[PDB]
Design an enzyme around this catalytic site. Structure first.
Site, PDB file in Angstrom:
ATOM      1  N   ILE A   1       8.898   8.743  -7.665  1.00  0.00           N
ATOM      2  CA  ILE A   1       9.501   8.330  -8.984  1.00  0.00           C
ATOM      3  C   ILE A   1      11.000   8.515  -9.350  1.00  0.00           C
ATOM      4  CG2 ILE A   1       8.474  10.300 -10.169  1.00  0.00           C
ATOM      5  CD1 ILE A   1       7.648   8.268 -12.392  1.00  0.00           C
TER       6      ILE A   1
ATOM      7  N   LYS B   1      20.442  -1.703   1.185  1.00  0.00           N
ATOM      8  CA  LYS B   1      20.631  -3.076   0.782  1.00  0.00           C
ATOM      9  C   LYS B   1      21.501  -3.776   1.727  1.00  0.00           C
ATOM     10  CE  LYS B   1      19.853  -1.271  -3.687  1.00  0.00           C
ATOM     11  NZ  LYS B   1      20.662  -0.344  -4.420  1.00  0.00           N
TER      12      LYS B   1
ATOM     13  N   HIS C   1      21.178  -7.260  -2.092  1.00  0.00           N
ATOM     14  CA  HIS C   1      21.870  -6.328  -2.998  1.00  0.00           C
ATOM     15  C   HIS C   1      22.087  -6.945  -4.363  1.00  0.00           C
ATOM     16  CE1 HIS C   1      24.491  -2.378  -2.962  1.00  0.00           C
ATOM     17  NE2 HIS C   1      23.824  -2.508  -4.135  1.00  0.00           N
TER      18      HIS C   1
ATOM     19  N   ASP D   1      18.595   6.449  -2.743  1.00  0.00           N
ATOM     20  CA  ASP D   1      19.127   5.085  -2.675  1.00  0.00           C
ATOM     21  C   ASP D   1      20.541   4.961  -2.143  1.00  0.00           C
ATOM     22  OD1 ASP D   1      18.469   1.810  -3.843  1.00  0.00           O
ATOM     23  OD2 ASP D   1      20.579   2.600  -3.871  1.00  0.00           O
TER      24      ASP D   1
ATOM     25  N   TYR E   1      28.411   1.110  -0.131  1.00  0.00           N
ATOM     26  CA  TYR E   1      28.740   2.401  -0.639  1.00  0.00           C
ATOM     27  C   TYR E   1      29.760   3.136   0.271  1.00  0.00           C
ATOM     28  CZ  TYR E   1      24.944   1.498  -4.021  1.00  0.00           C
ATOM     29  OH  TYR E   1      24.196   0.919  -5.038  1.00  0.00           O
TER      30      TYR E   1
ATOM     31  N   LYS F   1       3.737   4.340  -0.839  1.00  0.00           N
ATOM     32  CA  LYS F   1       3.889   5.182  -1.937  1.00  0.00           C
ATOM     33  C   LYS F   1       5.323   5.709  -2.095  1.00  0.00           C
ATOM     34  CE  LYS F   1      -0.355   7.405  -3.338  1.00  0.00           C
ATOM     35  NZ  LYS F   1      -1.613   7.802  -2.631  1.00  0.00           N
TER      36      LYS F   1
ATOM     37  N   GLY G   1       0.769  -1.236   0.000  1.00  0.00           N
ATOM     38  CA  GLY G   1       0.000   0.000   0.000  1.00  0.00           C
ATOM     39  C   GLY G   1       0.778   1.251   0.000  1.00  0.00           C
TER      40      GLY G   1
ATOM     41  N   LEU H   1      17.624  10.445  -5.532  1.00  0.00           N
ATOM     42  CA  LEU H   1      19.057  10.574  -5.524  1.00  0.00           C
ATOM     43  C   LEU H   1      19.797   9.264  -5.115  1.00  0.00           C
ATOM     44  CD1 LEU H   1      20.953  13.482  -4.048  1.00  0.00           C
ATOM     45  CD2 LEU H   1      21.268  11.560  -3.020  1.00  0.00           C
TER      46      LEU H   1
END
Ligand code: NAP
Ligand code: ZES
Length: 315
Positions: free
Chosen positions: A14, A77, A110, A43, A48, A11, A9, A17
């Protein structure tokens, strides 16, 4: 909206960064300007090596006042090193710690790709390849169904990751949860038309990583391909008085997708978010899809003999 529908459910925005390549020295500014601009989606990942610094930015944007926790969408991830169901657990813990939040909005495996646990983020052969792990696709999926049950993560899914490997997880017995999202790479030189309608078809959400073709990828050579600098894309961008990154970024969105652009560079953060003003025509859409060379950019090849290798079928 600006905002897709998850199976849970929830949201998802779209546009977000990306944070792969971004030194700990550049990543708080990058994130705080993205927030002042408007990106509510980001993300991250534990690999990283910058999560902790992503965090404080978020943290002072919160506590400064620009944004509410609610309105964020943080994504992160699972490293290859804790496909061990016993270890999935800690992996989300020190990332959430890293982040300085108490939950995460969407958590990823990942890779389809299990490797042996220790300090080293990539344990190698003694000769060529990664030292794999006996661990398990759908039996690792479970260790993070468990994470949802426990509160830690509001939703869950897979990174990149083929028809096969997807189609396993929903055939899993005892299946408590559905993958929300399939984070794959896409861009004009792999369009991947056909796992467009499997991923998503039948019915999960797609996030396009490396939308700009990623030209700071550590294996940075070629001599040749160059989405930023390509003649025929440049002209699309000229026609709309927009830039090529913009045209590039708009492109996944318009195919029902989610885009994670990276930059550290305040200029082009603020710029990269400037993409709601134009619609690409039916022709740019035909064209930028005719550009499909099948051409991978993330690709890694000392892992190629590994059983769960995403890139051994076609979709
Ligand atoms: N699950 C996965 O395996 C996975 C793998 C890859 C990517 N992703 C995620 O997706 C995100 C995006 O991919 P990416 O890092 O691979 O590459 P990318 O976002 O496609 O490309 C990054 C590079 O593009 C440059 N750039 C960005 N916007 C620009 C603009 N308007 N004009 C000119 N140059 C621009 C950036 O420059 P500067 O940044 O140098 O300013 C940067 O080095 C990553 O940060 C990562 O979190 C996920
Ligand atoms: O994993 C990421 O999102 C970004 N990213 C990436 O993409 N690959 C390629 C790769 C690694 C393992 C396998 Br298996 C297959 C692959 F092709 C990397 O080597 C990589 C190396 C270091 C960091 Cl910090 C991020 C990386």
């Amino acid at each position: 909206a600006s905002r897709l529908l998850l199976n849970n459910g929830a949201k998802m925005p779209i546009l977000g960064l990306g944070t792969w390549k971004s030194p700990p020295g550049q990543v708080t500014e990058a994130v705080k300007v993205a927030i002042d601009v408007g990106y509510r989606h980001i993300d991250c990942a534990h690999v990283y090596q910058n999560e902790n610094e992503v965090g404080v930015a978020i943290q002072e944007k919160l506590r400064e006042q620009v944004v509410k926790r609610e309105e964020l969408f943080i994504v992160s991830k699972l490293w290859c090193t804790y496909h061990e169901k016993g270890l999935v657990k800690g992996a989300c813990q020190k990332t959430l710690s890293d982040l300085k939040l108490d939950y995460l909005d969407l958590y990823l495996i990942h890779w389809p790709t299990g490797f042996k646990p220790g300090k080293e983020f990539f344990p190698l052969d003694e000769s060529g390849n990664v030292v794999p792990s006996d661990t398990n696709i759908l039996d690792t999926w479970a260790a993070m169904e468990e994470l949802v049950d426990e509160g830690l993560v509001k939703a869950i899914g897979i990174s990149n990751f083929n028809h096969l490997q997807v189609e396993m997880i929903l055939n899993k017995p005892g299946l408590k949860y559905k993958p929300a999202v399939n984070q794959i790479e896409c861009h004009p030189y792999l369009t991947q038309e056909k796992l467009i309608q499997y991923c998503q078809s039948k019915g999960i959400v797609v996030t396009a990583y490396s939308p700009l073709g990623s030209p700071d990828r550590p294996w940075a050579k070629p001599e040749d391909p160059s989405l930023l600098e390509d003649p025929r894309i440049k002209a699309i961008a000229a026609k709309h008085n927009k830039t090529t990154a913009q045209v590039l970024i708009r492109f996944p969105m318009q195919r029902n997708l989610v885009v994670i652009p990276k930059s550290v560079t305040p200029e082009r953060i603020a710029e990269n978010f400037k993409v709601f003003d134009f619609e690409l025509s039916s022709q740019d859409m035909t064209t930028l899809l005719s550009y499909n060379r099948n051409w991978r950019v993330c690709a890694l090849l000392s892992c190629t003999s590994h059983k769960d290798y995403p890139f051994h079928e076609e979709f």
